[PDB]
Amino acid sequence: IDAICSVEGILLLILSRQTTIPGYEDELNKLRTGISQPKVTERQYRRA
Amino acid sequence: NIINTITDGITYANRTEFFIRVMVLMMMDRKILTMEFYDVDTSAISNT
Amino acid sequence: NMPKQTYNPIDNLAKILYLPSLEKFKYGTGIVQLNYSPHISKLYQNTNNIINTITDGITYANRTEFFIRVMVLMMMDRKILTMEFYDVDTSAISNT
Amino acid sequence: DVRQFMNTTKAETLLISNKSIVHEIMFFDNALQPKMSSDTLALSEAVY
């Protein structure tokens, strides 16, 4: 269960912008540029 | 390979993908470094 | 007079967004009119046999039986539309 | 390194794009250009 939660957490990290803000909030923003929209469709999420 | 979008050439998407994969690489794969030394005396002169 | 296409760009999404349309209104059409589709235009026969009529022509009875057929079709034809989708960019698109 | 300053892209395609098609460009450098041989008559060639 720790492993599956870790997977889900890594996934949360780079989707759904307004969740992750550890200490930088800037290069994370740099990263997120590429999802093309501040909302992601499901099938994209599932395949990811 | 990770973001199913119909695109024209290369644009921010390969960059995002590349970030994800190098990230997930470094998150995994713990290693600790073991090296091997010599016995140099003072031959290495004048160079502190 | 057709125009020429120079400077061939990359079209990895034109073939999904435009090409099916753009050629229907390609530069050089005089009129574009609305019509019934095949699979319905075939319901418009000549020999009227749902409604006998004393004439040998294309009289109103044609229109009437044509109504009857499409009406009883639409009585039936319970269909459900299902479909998948692509996912494209939105910043690299002119139309909003 | 003049022997591999190969870079082929007609400015047409550079100009007709889709506003995010990020692509490659090369860049030479010769600021430390050594004097030419003691034979060359006169460099009468344009390198715009």
Coordinates of N, CA and C in Angstrom, one line a residue:
Chain A
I1 N 0.8 -1.2 0.0 CA 0.0 0.0 0.0 C 0.9 1.3 0.0
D2 N 2.0 1.2 0.6 CA 2.9 2.4 0.6 C 3.3 2.7 -0.9
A3 N 3.6 1.6 -1.6 CA 4.0 1.8 -3.0 C 2.9 2.4 -3.8
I4 N 1.7 1.9 -3.7 CA 0.6 2.5 -4.6 C 0.3 3.9 -4.2
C5 N 0.3 4.2 -2.9 CA 0.1 5.6 -2.5 C 1.2 6.5 -3.0
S6 N 2.5 6.0 -3.0 CA 3.6 6.8 -3.6 C 3.3 7.1 -5.1
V7 N 2.8 6.1 -5.8 CA 2.5 6.3 -7.2 C 1.5 7.4 -7.4
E8 N 0.4 7.3 -6.6 CA -0.6 8.3 -6.7 C -0.1 9.7 -6.4
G9 N 0.8 9.8 -5.4 CA 1.3 11.0 -5.0 C 2.2 11.7 -6.1
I10 N 3.1 10.9 -6.6 CA 3.9 11.4 -7.7 C 3.0 11.9 -8.8
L11 N 1.9 11.2 -9.1 CA 1.0 11.6 -10.1 C 0.3 13.0 -9.8
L12 N -0.2 13.1 -8.6 CA -0.8 14.3 -8.1 C 0.2 15.5 -8.3
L13 N 1.5 15.2 -8.1 CA 2.5 16.2 -8.2 C 2.5 17.1 -9.4
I14 N 2.3 16.4 -10.6 CA 2.5 17.1 -11.8 C 1.1 17.3 -12.6
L15 N 0.0 17.1 -11.9 CA -1.3 17.4 -12.4 C -2.1 18.1 -11.4
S16 N -3.1 18.8 -11.8 CA -4.0 19.5 -10.9 C -3.2 20.6 -10.2
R17 N -2.7 21.6 -10.9 CA -1.8 22.6 -10.4 C -1.9 23.0 -8.9
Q18 N -3.2 23.3 -8.5 CA -3.3 23.9 -7.2 C -3.3 22.9 -6.0
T19 N -2.3 22.0 -6.0 CA -2.2 21.1 -4.9 C -0.8 21.1 -4.3
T20 N 0.2 21.3 -5.1 CA 1.6 21.1 -4.7 C 2.3 22.4 -4.7
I21 N 2.8 22.7 -3.5 CA 3.5 24.0 -3.3 C 4.6 23.8 -2.2
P22 N 5.5 22.9 -2.3 CA 6.4 22.6 -1.2 C 7.2 23.8 -0.7
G23 N 8.1 24.3 -1.6 CA 8.8 25.5 -1.3 C 9.2 26.4 -2.4
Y24 N 8.9 26.0 -3.7 CA 9.4 26.7 -4.8 C 8.2 27.3 -5.6
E25 N 7.3 26.5 -6.1 CA 6.1 27.0 -6.7 C 6.4 27.7 -8.0
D26 N 7.7 27.8 -8.4 CA 8.0 28.5 -9.6 C 8.6 27.5 -10.7
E27 N 9.5 26.7 -10.4 CA 10.0 25.7 -11.4 C 8.9 24.6 -11.5
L28 N 8.1 24.3 -10.5 CA 7.0 23.4 -10.6 C 6.1 24.0 -11.7
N29 N 5.9 25.3 -11.6 CA 5.1 26.0 -12.7 C 5.7 25.9 -14.0
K30 N 7.1 26.0 -14.1 CA 7.8 25.8 -15.3 C 7.6 24.4 -15.9
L31 N 7.6 23.4 -15.0 CA 7.3 22.0 -15.4 C 5.9 21.9 -16.0
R32 N 4.9 22.3 -15.2 CA 3.5 22.0 -15.6 C 3.2 22.6 -17.0
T33 N 3.9 23.6 -17.4 CA 3.7 24.0 -18.8 C 3.9 22.9 -19.8
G34 N 2.9 22.4 -20.4 CA 2.9 21.3 -21.2 C 1.7 20.4 -21.1
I35 N 0.9 20.6 -20.1 CA -0.4 19.9 -20.0 C -1.5 20.7 -20.7
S36 N -1.2 21.9 -21.2 CA -2.0 22.6 -22.2 C -3.3 23.1 -21.6
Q37 N -3.6 22.8 -20.4 CA -4.9 23.3 -19.8 C -4.9 23.2 -18.3
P38 N -5.5 24.1 -17.6 CA -5.6 24.0 -16.1 C -6.8 23.0 -15.8
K39 N -6.9 21.9 -16.5 CA -7.8 20.8 -16.2 C -7.5 19.7 -17.2
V40 N -7.4 18.5 -16.8 CA -6.9 17.4 -17.6 C -8.1 16.4 -17.8
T41 N -8.2 15.9 -19.0 CA -9.3 14.9 -19.2 C -8.9 13.6 -18.6
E42 N -9.9 12.7 -18.4 CA -9.8 11.5 -17.6 C -8.8 10.6 -18.4
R43 N -9.1 10.2 -19.6 CA -8.3 9.2 -20.3 C -6.9 9.5 -20.3
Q44 N -6.5 10.8 -20.4 CA -5.1 11.2 -20.2 C -4.6 10.8 -18.9
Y45 N -5.4 11.1 -17.8 CA -5.0 10.7 -16.5 C -4.8 9.2 -16.3
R46 N -5.7 8.4 -16.8 CA -5.6 7.0 -16.7 C -4.4 6.5 -17.4
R47 N -4.2 6.9 -18.6 CA -3.0 6.4 -19.4 C -1.7 6.9 -18.7
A48 N -1.7 8.1 -18.1 CA -0.5 8.5 -17.4 C -0.2 7.6 -16.3
Chain B
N1 N 5.2 10.0 -25.7 CA 4.9 8.7 -25.3 C 3.9 8.7 -24.1
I2 N 3.8 9.9 -23.4 CA 3.0 10.0 -22.2 C 1.9 10.9 -22.3
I3 N 1.9 11.9 -23.2 CA 0.8 12.9 -23.3 C 0.2 12.8 -24.7
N4 N -0.9 12.1 -24.8 CA -1.6 11.8 -26.0 C -2.2 13.1 -26.6
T5 N -1.4 13.9 -27.3 CA -1.9 15.1 -27.9 C -1.5 15.1 -29.3
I6 N -2.3 15.5 -30.2 CA -2.0 15.6 -31.6 C -1.3 16.9 -31.8
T7 N 0.0 16.9 -32.1 CA 0.9 18.0 -32.1 C 1.6 18.1 -33.4
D8 N 2.4 19.2 -33.6 CA 3.0 19.5 -34.9 C 4.5 19.7 -34.7
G9 N 5.2 18.6 -34.8 CA 6.6 18.7 -34.5 C 6.9 18.4 -33.0
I10 N 7.7 19.3 -32.4 CA 8.1 19.1 -31.0 C 7.9 20.4 -30.2
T11 N 7.1 20.4 -29.1 CA 6.7 21.6 -28.4 C 6.4 21.3 -27.0
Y12 N 7.3 21.6 -26.1 CA 7.0 21.6 -24.6 C 6.6 20.3 -24.1
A13 N 6.2 19.4 -25.0 CA 5.6 18.1 -24.6 C 6.7 17.1 -24.3
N14 N 7.6 17.0 -25.3 CA 8.8 16.2 -25.0 C 9.6 16.7 -23.8
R15 N 9.6 18.1 -23.6 CA 10.3 18.6 -22.4 C 9.6 18.1 -21.2
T16 N 8.3 18.2 -21.1 CA 7.6 17.7 -19.9 C 7.8 16.3 -19.7
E17 N 7.7 15.5 -20.8 CA 7.9 14.0 -20.7 C 9.3 13.7 -20.2
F18 N 10.3 14.4 -20.7 CA 11.7 14.2 -20.3 C 11.8 14.5 -18.8
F19 N 11.3 15.6 -18.4 CA 11.3 16.0 -17.0 C 10.8 14.8 -16.1
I20 N 9.6 14.3 -16.5 CA 9.0 13.3 -15.7 C 9.9 12.1 -15.6
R21 N 10.5 11.7 -16.7 CA 11.2 10.4 -16.7 C 12.5 10.6 -15.9
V22 N 13.2 11.7 -16.1 CA 14.4 11.8 -15.3 C 14.1 11.9 -13.9
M23 N 13.0 12.6 -13.6 CA 12.6 12.7 -12.2 C 12.3 11.3 -11.6
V24 N 11.6 10.5 -12.2 CA 11.2 9.2 -11.7 C 12.4 8.3 -11.6
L25 N 13.4 8.6 -12.5 CA 14.7 7.9 -12.4 C 15.3 8.2 -11.0
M26 N 15.5 9.5 -10.8 CA 16.3 9.9 -9.6 C 15.5 9.6 -8.3
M27 N 14.2 9.6 -8.4 CA 13.5 9.2 -7.2 C 13.8 7.8 -6.8
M28 N 14.0 7.0 -7.8 CA 14.3 5.6 -7.5 C 15.9 5.5 -7.4
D29 N 16.3 4.2 -7.4 CA 17.8 3.9 -7.6 C 18.7 4.6 -6.6
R30 N 18.6 4.2 -5.3 CA 19.6 4.6 -4.4 C 21.0 3.9 -4.7
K31 N 22.0 4.6 -4.5 CA 23.4 4.1 -4.6 C 24.3 4.8 -3.6
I32 N 25.3 4.1 -3.2 CA 26.3 4.7 -2.4 C 27.7 4.4 -2.9
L33 N 28.6 5.4 -2.9 CA 29.8 5.4 -3.7 C 30.9 4.8 -2.9
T34 N 31.6 3.9 -3.5 CA 32.8 3.2 -3.0 C 34.0 3.4 -3.9
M35 N 35.1 4.0 -3.4 CA 36.2 4.3 -4.3 C 37.4 3.6 -3.8
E36 N 38.6 3.9 -4.4 CA 39.8 3.2 -4.1 C 40.9 4.2 -4.2
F37 N 41.9 4.2 -3.3 CA 42.9 5.2 -3.2 C 44.3 4.8 -3.5
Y38 N 45.2 5.7 -3.5 CA 46.6 5.4 -3.8 C 47.5 5.5 -2.6
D39 N 48.7 6.0 -2.8 CA 49.7 6.2 -1.7 C 50.7 7.4 -2.0
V40 N 50.2 8.4 -2.7 CA 51.0 9.5 -3.1 C 51.6 10.1 -1.8
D41 N 52.9 10.4 -1.9 CA 53.7 11.0 -0.8 C 53.7 12.5 -0.9
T42 N 54.8 13.1 -1.5 CA 54.9 14.5 -1.7 C 55.3 14.8 -3.1
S43 N 55.3 13.8 -4.0 CA 55.6 14.0 -5.4 C 54.8 15.1 -6.0
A44 N 53.5 15.3 -5.5 CA 52.6 16.4 -6.0 C 53.0 17.6 -5.3
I45 N 54.0 18.3 -5.9 CA 54.7 19.4 -5.1 C 54.1 20.8 -5.5
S46 N 54.1 21.7 -4.5 CA 53.8 23.1 -4.7 C 52.3 23.3 -5.0
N47 N 51.6 22.2 -5.1 CA 50.1 22.3 -5.3 C 49.4 21.9 -4.1
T48 N 49.1 22.9 -3.3 CA 48.3 22.7 -2.1 C 46.9 22.0 -2.5
Chain C
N1 N -10.3 29.4 -61.8 CA -8.9 29.5 -61.6 C -8.5 29.0 -60.2
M2 N -7.7 28.0 -60.1 CA -7.3 27.5 -58.8 C -6.1 28.2 -58.3
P3 N -5.9 28.4 -57.0 CA -4.7 28.9 -56.5 C -3.7 27.8 -56.3
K4 N -2.4 28.2 -56.1 CA -1.4 27.2 -55.8 C -1.0 27.2 -54.3
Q5 N -0.4 26.1 -53.9 CA 0.0 25.9 -52.5 C 1.5 25.8 -52.5
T6 N 2.1 26.9 -52.0 CA 3.6 26.9 -51.8 C 3.9 26.9 -50.3
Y7 N 5.1 26.5 -50.0 CA 5.6 26.4 -48.6 C 4.8 25.4 -47.9
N8 N 4.9 24.1 -48.2 CA 4.2 23.1 -47.6 C 4.5 23.0 -46.1
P9 N 3.5 23.3 -45.2 CA 3.8 23.3 -43.8 C 3.6 21.8 -43.3
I10 N 3.7 21.7 -42.0 CA 3.4 20.4 -41.4 C 1.9 20.4 -40.9
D11 N 1.2 19.3 -41.2 CA -0.2 19.2 -41.0 C -0.6 18.0 -40.2
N12 N 0.0 17.8 -39.0 CA -0.3 16.6 -38.3 C -1.7 16.6 -37.7
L13 N -2.4 17.8 -37.8 CA -3.8 17.9 -37.3 C -4.7 18.5 -38.3
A14 N -4.2 19.1 -39.4 CA -5.1 19.5 -40.5 C -5.9 18.4 -41.0
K15 N -5.3 17.2 -41.2 CA -5.9 16.1 -41.7 C -7.0 15.5 -40.8
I16 N -7.1 16.1 -39.6 CA -8.2 15.7 -38.7 C -9.2 16.9 -38.4
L17 N -8.8 18.1 -38.6 CA -9.7 19.2 -38.3 C -10.2 19.9 -39.5
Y18 N -9.5 20.0 -40.6 CA -9.9 20.8 -41.7 C -10.2 20.0 -42.9
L19 N -9.3 19.2 -43.4 CA -9.4 18.5 -44.7 C -10.8 17.9 -45.0
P20 N -11.5 17.3 -44.0 CA -12.8 16.8 -44.3 C -13.8 18.0 -44.6
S21 N -13.6 19.1 -44.0 CA -14.4 20.3 -44.3 C -13.9 21.1 -45.5
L22 N -12.7 21.6 -45.4 CA -12.2 22.6 -46.3 C -12.4 22.3 -47.7
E23 N -12.3 21.0 -48.1 CA -12.5 20.7 -49.5 C -14.0 20.8 -49.9
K24 N -14.9 20.7 -49.0 CA -16.3 20.9 -49.3 C -16.6 22.3 -49.7
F25 N -15.9 23.3 -49.2 CA -16.0 24.7 -49.5 C -14.7 25.1 -50.1
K26 N -14.0 24.3 -50.9 CA -12.8 24.7 -51.5 C -13.0 25.9 -52.5
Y27 N -12.0 26.7 -52.5 CA -12.0 27.9 -53.3 C -12.4 27.6 -54.8
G28 N -13.6 28.0 -55.2 CA -14.0 27.7 -56.5 C -15.4 27.0 -56.6
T29 N -16.2 27.2 -55.6 CA -17.6 26.7 -55.7 C -18.6 27.8 -55.9
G30 N -19.5 27.6 -56.8 CA -20.5 28.7 -57.1 C -21.6 28.7 -56.1
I31 N -22.3 27.5 -55.9 CA -23.4 27.4 -55.0 C -23.1 26.2 -54.0
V32 N -23.6 26.4 -52.8 CA -23.6 25.3 -51.9 C -25.0 25.2 -51.3
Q33 N -25.7 24.1 -51.6 CA -27.1 24.0 -51.2 C -27.3 22.8 -50.2
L34 N -28.4 22.9 -49.5 CA -28.7 21.9 -48.5 C -29.6 20.8 -49.2
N35 N -29.3 19.6 -48.9 CA -30.1 18.5 -49.5 C -30.3 17.4 -48.5
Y36 N -31.3 16.6 -48.8 CA -31.4 15.3 -48.1 C -30.2 14.4 -48.4
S37 N -30.0 13.5 -47.5 CA -28.9 12.6 -47.7 C -29.3 11.4 -48.5
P38 N -28.3 10.7 -49.0 CA -28.6 9.3 -49.4 C -29.1 8.6 -48.2
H39 N -29.8 7.4 -48.4 CA -30.5 6.7 -47.4 C -31.8 7.4 -47.0
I40 N -32.1 8.6 -47.5 CA -33.4 9.2 -47.4 C -33.9 9.5 -48.8
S41 N -33.0 10.2 -49.6 CA -33.4 10.4 -51.0 C -33.8 9.2 -51.7
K42 N -33.3 8.0 -51.3 CA -33.7 6.8 -51.9 C -35.2 6.4 -51.5
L43 N -35.7 7.1 -50.5 CA -37.1 6.8 -50.1 C -38.1 7.6 -51.0
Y44 N -37.6 8.3 -52.0 CA -38.5 9.1 -52.8 C -38.6 8.4 -54.2
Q45 N -39.5 7.4 -54.2 CA -39.7 6.7 -55.4 C -40.7 7.4 -56.3
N46 N -40.9 6.8 -57.5 CA -41.9 7.3 -58.4 C -43.2 6.6 -58.4
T47 N -43.2 5.3 -58.6 CA -44.4 4.5 -58.7 C -45.1 4.5 -57.4
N48 N -46.2 5.3 -57.3 CA -46.9 5.5 -56.0 C -47.8 4.2 -55.7
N49 N -47.3 3.4 -54.8 CA -48.2 2.3 -54.3 C -48.1 2.4 -52.8
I50 N -48.7 3.4 -52.2 CA -49.3 3.3 -50.8 C -50.6 4.0 -51.0
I51 N -50.7 4.9 -52.0 CA -51.9 5.7 -52.2 C -52.2 5.7 -53.7
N52 N -53.2 4.9 -54.1 CA -53.6 4.9 -55.5 C -54.0 6.3 -56.0
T53 N -53.8 6.6 -57.2 CA -54.1 7.8 -57.8 C -54.4 7.7 -59.3
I54 N -55.4 8.4 -59.8 CA -55.8 8.3 -61.2 C -55.0 9.4 -61.9
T55 N -53.7 9.1 -62.3 CA -52.9 9.8 -63.1 C -51.6 9.1 -63.3
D56 N -50.8 9.4 -64.4 CA -49.5 8.8 -64.6 C -48.5 10.0 -64.6
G57 N -48.1 10.4 -63.4 CA -47.2 11.5 -63.3 C -46.5 11.5 -62.0
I58 N -46.0 12.7 -61.6 CA -45.2 12.8 -60.4 C -46.0 13.6 -59.4
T59 N -47.4 13.4 -59.4 CA -48.3 14.2 -58.6 C -48.0 14.2 -57.1
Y60 N -48.7 15.0 -56.4 CA -48.6 15.2 -55.0 C -48.5 13.9 -54.2
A61 N -49.2 12.9 -54.7 CA -49.2 11.6 -54.0 C -47.8 11.1 -53.8
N62 N -46.8 11.4 -54.7 CA -45.4 11.1 -54.4 C -45.0 11.8 -53.1
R63 N -45.1 13.1 -53.0 CA -44.8 13.8 -51.8 C -45.4 13.1 -50.6
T64 N -46.7 12.7 -50.7 CA -47.4 12.2 -49.5 C -46.8 10.9 -49.1
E65 N -46.6 9.9 -50.0 CA -46.1 8.7 -49.6 C -44.7 8.8 -49.1
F66 N -43.9 9.8 -49.7 CA -42.6 10.1 -49.2 C -42.7 10.5 -47.7
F67 N -43.6 11.3 -47.4 CA -43.8 11.7 -46.0 C -44.1 10.4 -45.1
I68 N -44.9 9.5 -45.6 CA -45.4 8.4 -44.8 C -44.2 7.5 -44.5
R69 N -43.3 7.3 -45.5 CA -42.2 6.4 -45.3 C -41.2 6.9 -44.2
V70 N -40.8 8.2 -44.4 CA -39.8 8.7 -43.5 C -40.5 8.9 -42.1
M71 N -41.8 9.1 -42.0 CA -42.4 9.2 -40.7 C -42.4 7.8 -40.0
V72 N -42.7 6.8 -40.7 CA -42.7 5.5 -40.0 C -41.3 5.0 -39.8
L73 N -40.3 5.5 -40.5 CA -38.9 5.3 -40.1 C -38.6 6.0 -38.8
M74 N -38.9 7.2 -38.7 CA -38.6 7.9 -37.4 C -39.4 7.4 -36.3
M75 N -40.5 6.8 -36.5 CA -41.2 6.1 -35.4 C -40.3 5.0 -34.8
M76 N -39.7 4.2 -35.7 CA -38.6 3.3 -35.3 C -37.3 4.2 -35.2
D77 N -36.1 3.5 -35.3 CA -34.8 4.2 -35.3 C -34.6 4.8 -33.9
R78 N -34.6 4.0 -32.9 CA -34.1 4.3 -31.6 C -32.6 4.0 -31.6
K79 N -31.8 5.0 -31.7 CA -30.3 4.9 -31.7 C -29.7 5.7 -30.6
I80 N -28.5 5.3 -30.2 CA -27.8 6.1 -29.2 C -26.4 6.4 -29.8
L81 N -26.0 7.6 -29.7 CA -24.7 8.0 -30.3 C -23.6 7.9 -29.2
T82 N -22.6 7.1 -29.5 CA -21.4 7.0 -28.7 C -20.2 7.2 -29.6
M83 N -19.1 7.7 -29.0 CA -18.0 8.0 -29.7 C -16.8 8.4 -28.8
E84 N -15.6 8.2 -29.3 CA -14.4 8.6 -28.6 C -13.9 9.9 -29.2
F85 N -12.8 10.4 -28.6 CA -12.3 11.7 -29.0 C -10.8 11.7 -29.0
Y86 N -10.2 12.5 -29.8 CA -8.8 12.9 -29.8 C -8.6 13.9 -28.6
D87 N -7.4 14.4 -28.5 CA -7.2 15.5 -27.5 C -6.1 16.3 -28.1
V88 N -6.4 17.6 -28.4 CA -5.5 18.5 -29.2 C -5.1 19.6 -28.3
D89 N -4.1 20.4 -28.8 CA -3.8 21.6 -28.1 C -4.9 22.7 -28.3
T90 N -4.8 23.7 -27.5 CA -5.7 24.9 -27.6 C -5.0 26.2 -27.8
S91 N -3.7 26.3 -27.4 CA -3.0 27.6 -27.6 C -2.5 27.7 -29.0
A92 N -2.2 26.6 -29.7 CA -1.8 26.6 -31.1 C -3.0 26.3 -32.0
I93 N -4.0 27.1 -31.8 CA -5.2 27.0 -32.6 C -5.8 28.5 -32.7
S94 N -6.1 28.9 -33.9 CA -6.6 30.2 -34.2 C -7.9 30.4 -33.6
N95 N -8.9 29.7 -34.1 CA -10.3 29.8 -33.6 C -10.3 29.5 -32.1
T96 N -11.1 30.3 -31.3 CA -11.3 30.0 -29.9 C -12.5 29.2 -29.7
Chain D
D1 N 33.6 24.7 -34.8 CA 34.4 23.8 -35.6 C 33.8 23.8 -37.0
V2 N 34.4 24.5 -37.9 CA 33.8 24.8 -39.2 C 33.4 23.5 -39.9
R3 N 34.1 22.4 -39.7 CA 33.8 21.2 -40.4 C 32.5 20.6 -40.2
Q4 N 31.8 21.0 -39.1 CA 30.5 20.5 -38.8 C 29.5 21.6 -38.3
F5 N 29.6 22.7 -39.0 CA 28.7 23.8 -38.9 C 27.6 23.6 -39.9
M6 N 27.0 22.5 -39.9 CA 25.9 22.2 -40.8 C 24.6 22.4 -40.2
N7 N 23.7 23.2 -40.8 CA 22.5 23.6 -40.2 C 21.5 24.0 -41.4
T8 N 20.5 23.2 -41.6 CA 19.7 23.3 -42.8 C 18.2 23.5 -42.4
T9 N 17.7 24.7 -42.6 CA 16.3 25.0 -42.4 C 16.0 26.3 -43.1
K10 N 15.2 26.2 -44.1 CA 14.8 27.3 -44.9 C 13.9 28.3 -44.1
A11 N 14.3 29.6 -44.1 CA 13.6 30.5 -43.2 C 12.1 30.5 -43.5
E12 N 11.6 30.0 -44.6 CA 10.2 29.9 -44.8 C 9.5 29.1 -43.7
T13 N 10.0 27.8 -43.5 CA 9.4 27.0 -42.4 C 9.6 27.6 -41.1
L14 N 10.7 28.4 -40.9 CA 10.8 29.1 -39.6 C 9.7 30.1 -39.4
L15 N 9.2 30.7 -40.5 CA 8.2 31.7 -40.4 C 6.8 31.2 -40.4
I16 N 6.5 30.2 -41.1 CA 5.1 29.6 -41.2 C 5.1 28.4 -40.3
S17 N 4.6 28.7 -39.0 CA 4.6 27.6 -38.0 C 3.3 27.8 -37.2
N18 N 3.2 27.2 -36.0 CA 2.0 27.2 -35.2 C 2.3 27.7 -33.8
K19 N 3.2 28.6 -33.7 CA 3.4 29.5 -32.6 C 4.0 28.7 -31.4
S20 N 4.0 27.4 -31.5 CA 4.8 26.6 -30.5 C 5.2 25.3 -31.2
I21 N 6.4 25.4 -31.9 CA 6.8 24.3 -32.7 C 8.3 24.1 -32.4
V22 N 8.8 24.5 -31.2 CA 10.1 24.8 -30.9 C 11.1 23.9 -31.5
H23 N 12.1 24.5 -32.3 CA 12.9 23.7 -33.2 C 14.4 24.2 -33.0
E24 N 15.3 23.5 -33.7 CA 16.7 23.6 -33.5 C 17.3 24.7 -34.4
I25 N 18.3 25.4 -33.9 CA 19.2 26.3 -34.6 C 20.6 26.1 -34.2
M26 N 21.5 26.1 -35.1 CA 23.0 26.1 -34.8 C 23.5 27.5 -34.7
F27 N 24.7 27.6 -34.2 CA 25.4 28.9 -34.0 C 26.9 28.7 -34.1
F28 N 27.5 29.3 -35.1 CA 28.9 29.3 -35.2 C 29.5 30.3 -34.3
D29 N 30.9 30.3 -34.2 CA 31.6 31.3 -33.4 C 33.0 31.3 -33.9
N30 N 33.5 32.5 -34.2 CA 34.9 32.7 -34.6 C 35.6 33.9 -34.1
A31 N 35.2 34.3 -32.9 CA 35.8 35.6 -32.4 C 37.3 35.5 -32.3
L32 N 37.9 34.4 -32.0 CA 39.3 34.2 -32.0 C 39.8 33.7 -33.3
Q33 N 39.5 34.4 -34.4 CA 39.8 34.0 -35.7 C 41.3 34.1 -36.1
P34 N 42.1 33.1 -36.2 CA 43.5 33.2 -36.5 C 43.7 33.8 -37.9
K35 N 44.8 34.5 -38.1 CA 45.1 35.1 -39.3 C 45.1 34.1 -40.4
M36 N 44.8 34.5 -41.6 CA 44.8 33.5 -42.7 C 46.2 33.4 -43.2
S37 N 46.4 32.4 -44.1 CA 47.7 32.0 -44.6 C 48.4 33.2 -45.2
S38 N 49.7 33.1 -45.5 CA 50.5 34.2 -46.1 C 50.4 34.2 -47.6
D39 N 49.4 33.6 -48.1 CA 49.2 33.5 -49.6 C 47.9 34.1 -50.1
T40 N 46.8 33.8 -49.4 CA 45.5 34.4 -49.8 C 45.7 35.8 -50.4
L41 N 45.3 36.0 -51.6 CA 45.4 37.3 -52.3 C 44.6 38.4 -51.6
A42 N 43.2 38.3 -51.7 CA 42.3 39.2 -51.1 C 40.9 38.6 -50.9
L43 N 40.5 38.5 -49.7 CA 39.1 37.9 -49.4 C 38.1 38.8 -50.1
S44 N 37.7 38.5 -51.3 CA 36.7 39.2 -52.0 C 35.4 38.4 -52.1
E45 N 35.0 37.7 -51.1 CA 33.8 36.9 -51.0 C 32.9 37.3 -49.9
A46 N 31.6 37.4 -50.2 CA 30.6 37.8 -49.2 C 30.1 36.6 -48.5
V47 N 29.9 36.7 -47.2 CA 29.4 35.7 -46.3 C 28.2 36.1 -45.5
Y48 N 27.4 36.9 -46.1 CA 26.2 37.5 -45.4 C 25.6 36.4 -44.4

